[PDB]
Each structure stands twice: as C-alpha cells, then as structure tokens.
Design an enzyme around this catalytic site. Sequence first.
Site, PDB file in Angstrom:
ATOM      1  N   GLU A 124     -17.494 -29.082  15.021  1.00 23.78           N
ATOM      2  CA  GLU A 124     -18.131 -28.605  16.250  1.00 23.78           C
ATOM      3  C   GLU A 124     -17.139 -27.982  17.228  1.00 23.78           C
ATOM      4  O   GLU A 124     -17.283 -28.112  18.447  1.00 23.78           O
ATOM      5  CB  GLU A 124     -18.957 -29.699  16.900  1.00 23.78           C
ATOM      6  CG  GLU A 124     -20.118 -30.147  16.031  1.00 23.78           C
ATOM      7  CD  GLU A 124     -20.831 -31.376  16.537  1.00 23.78           C
ATOM      8  OE1 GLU A 124     -20.616 -31.767  17.727  1.00 23.78           O
ATOM      9  OE2 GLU A 124     -21.655 -31.987  15.778  1.00 23.78           O
TER      10      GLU A 124
ATOM     11  N   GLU B  22     -24.647 -32.020   9.890  1.00 24.02           N
ATOM     12  CA  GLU B  22     -25.256 -33.043  10.770  1.00 24.02           C
ATOM     13  C   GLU B  22     -26.629 -32.571  11.195  1.00 24.02           C
ATOM     14  O   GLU B  22     -26.824 -31.373  11.433  1.00 24.02           O
ATOM     15  CB  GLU B  22     -24.495 -33.305  12.066  1.00 24.02           C
ATOM     16  CG  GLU B  22     -23.113 -33.882  11.896  1.00 24.02           C
ATOM     17  CD  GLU B  22     -22.474 -34.274  13.222  1.00 24.02           C
ATOM     18  OE1 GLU B  22     -23.192 -34.403  14.242  1.00 24.02           O
ATOM     19  OE2 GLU B  22     -21.223 -34.398  13.245  1.00 24.02           O
TER      20      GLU B  22
END
Length: 330
Positions: free
Chosen positions: A177, A274
């Site tokens: 991320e 995710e």
Amino acid sequence: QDWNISSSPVTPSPSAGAQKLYSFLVQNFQKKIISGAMTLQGGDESAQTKEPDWLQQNAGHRPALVGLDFMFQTGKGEEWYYNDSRFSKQVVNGAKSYWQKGGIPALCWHWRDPSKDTDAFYSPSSGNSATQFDADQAVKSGTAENKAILQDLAVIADQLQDLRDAGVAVLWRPLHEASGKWFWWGYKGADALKKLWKIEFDYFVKERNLNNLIWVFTAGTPIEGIADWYPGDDMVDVIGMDIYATQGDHATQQDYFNQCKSIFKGRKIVAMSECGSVPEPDLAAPWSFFMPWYNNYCIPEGSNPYNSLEFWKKTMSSSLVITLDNMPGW
Ligand SMILES: *[C@@]1(O[C@H]2[C@H](O)[C@@H](O)[C@H](O[C@H]3[C@H](O)[C@@H](O)[C@H](O[C@H]4[C@H](O)[C@H](O)[C@@H](O)O[C@@H]4CO)O[C@@H]3CO)O[C@@H]2CO)O[C@H](CO)[C@@H](O)[C@H](O)[C@H]1O
Ligand SMILES: OC[C@H]1O[C@@H](O[C@H]2[C@H](O)[C@H](O)[C@@H](O)O[C@@H]2CO)[C@H](O)[C@@H](O)[C@@H]1O
Ligand SMILES: [Mg+2]
Ligand SMILES: [Mg+2]
Ligand code: NA
Ligand code: NA
C-alpha cells in the site's frame, strides 16, 4: 490486448518450492480463484489459525492461502514477541505448517519505525500515531536510517532463510500500500519506494540468497499514477490490489482487475492481495487469489457482515475456487 506472463519467476535459480508455487499460480490464473484468509499475529497462540479453522468448520474447507505478518518481529518495545520462544518463530512456524499441508503462505510486514524512536509504521499523513522515519534518507548509503533498515532487513531475512532451508516458498508482499502514503515507506513518494524495493530485493535475493520468494507488488488502492511507483518487471512476480469495498459488497471489482492488466501490460498475474468483502468468484474478473483481512473481515459479525456464512459456504464450494483440499502438495 494479450496476456504475456513469464513461466518463471523473477528470482534467478528459484528454489524447487518457489518454481512449483509460481507455476501453480501461472497455470491456474484465469481458470480458478485461490481462496485465502489473513490471520492476526501476536501473543495469542490459539488464535493463530482461527480464520482458516472457522472456514473449515463452517464452510467445509480451509483456504488454500494463509496470510501472516512480521509486524512484531522488529520494533521498539516488541521484545515480548521477538525474544520470546513462544512467538519469535510464530511466523516461520505458521508458514511451515501451512506449506506442509499443501497451502500457500502469503507474508507481509507492517514494518515498525526502523529508528526505534517510536513503534509506529503509520506515517504523518495517516491520521494515526506516526513515525517520522524518512524513507528518502533510508535509501541513501551511510545514513542512520540506512543502517537501521539494513539491521531490520537482516532479522527478517533470517526468518525467510529458515523457511528457505525447510523447503518452504512464500508469497512475499513487502512495502505494501505504498501509494496511499499512510505508511512510512510510501510517505515520501515513488522515488524512495522504488529505491527501498531495490535495496530489499538485492539484499534478500543476491546477498542472502533467498530464492524461495514470489514477489507481490501492491498497486493500490489508490491506483492513480501507480506506473511511477512500479519497481519493474524484473523485481515483481504478482500485482496485488488491496481493495476495501463497502461492507457487504461482493462486487467483482472488474474495473480494477482490467486496470492492472492494462497498466502492467499483461505481464504479471493479478491478485486481490487484501479485501474486506470478497469479490464474487467470476472468470471475467479472475483474481489469482483473494485474502480478506483478519477478525470480522473474515469471520462474520452482525447483520451486515463483510463475508456472511452463506457467502462463505457458496464460495468455498464453487468449482471456480481452489481450497486447501484442491492443492496438490508441494
Ligand atoms: C502487547 O501489546 C500489543 C497488543 O497486545 C496488541 O493488541 C497489538 O496489536 C495491534 C498492533 O500493534 C497493530 O499494529 C495492529 O494494526 C493493524 C491495524 O489496526 C489494522 O487492523 C490493519 O492496518 O493492520 C494492522 C496490522 O495488523 O493492530 C493490532 C490490534 O489488532 O500490538 C501491541 C504491541 O505493539 O501485548 C503483549 C501480549 O499480550 C504484551 O506482552 C505486551 O507487553 C504488550 O505491549
Ligand atoms: O500447459 C498447457 C497450455 O497452457 C497454456 O497457458 C494457459 C495457462 O497455463 C493458464 O492455464 C491460463 O492462463 O490459461 C492459459 C491458456 O490455456 C499455454 O498457453 C499453452 O501453450 C500450453 O499448451
Ligand atoms: Mg528497472
Ligand atoms: Mg456473474
Ligand atoms: Na483507487
Ligand atoms: Na452470517
């Protein structure tokens, strides 16, 4: 536009296990979707397999992939974990155990402030308790920050080497991320992120001879401008998306799938590294694997759960979905 995926991973001379894992991903990509679940590391031994165990009992099958995190392996005040015999090998043992059953360990690392001034991985733009650790300094040889990251990288490499020597291969999803800038490794932007990736890739693959890793680059969300964050085709095996839809929304996220195909020129397998609510299995948006986050993101709670019991029963019995019971054994 055609797909153009390499049949070999980026690591030169991959381990037998890594080549088997990579080939399994290549051969199943676009035809099946690998089920996954994240777990919560820490001081709770019982709870280390709670999400896969819940899935076995309630949906009839364990996920093929299990997620684990090195977040407590280093960091200020984390000695209770990394110096305790009960926990210092929790990640290695969890990965070993799932691999031995034929499953896929997927490892990440919420990397705590390498300076040890704080215990935080969150950045000053995250809204959370933050570290000031400066990635731009960490990538420059001879700075205090550079020395600190190399110390921490040695600790994690020791764990991954234990896995290597046991014949275990893993999905390795570091520096994840980054584009959100909410973790210190992405907080300075693309330039430091790519330089950090190279430092880690070279240290792990070349200096430490860790040939057992399948490298997952997390491309968003946010995906805008991610091309400038990409470490390159020679240091990434899989493109992963971390997409948190509205709670209860099982949309396939087709558009994000298509964007990862286009942006990366069809050169890499695309996965949902995710999620909250799991995308409905669909060969029009055939995520290589999915992995809901731990706790309530997997095990349902309340009247609008992320992934209901009925959703899980459907998903884990689908012919499109690979569960632990479909795995060949490594
Ligand atoms: C030690 O303290 C532990 C504490 O017991 C434990 O709950 C804890 O877990 C936190 C973790 O610090 C944090 O990084 C993590 O962040 C999540 C985030 O909230 C979100 O889910 C997503 O982004 O992923 C992140 C990474 O998982 O949230 C968890 C809680 O779920 O961390 C502290 C230590 O840092 O507990 C032990 C054992 O009881 C004691 O011996 C220690 O003394 C105590 O400090
Ligand atoms: O090895 C058998 C054939 O595999 C073909 O590629 C597959 C790939 O392994 C995945 O299953 C998915 O992407 O589908 C493609 C298309 O079937 C390959 O292109 C063939 O040359 C080969 O004979
Ligand atoms: Mg390059
Ligand atoms: Mg449909
Ligand atoms: Na986005
Ligand atoms: Na439910």
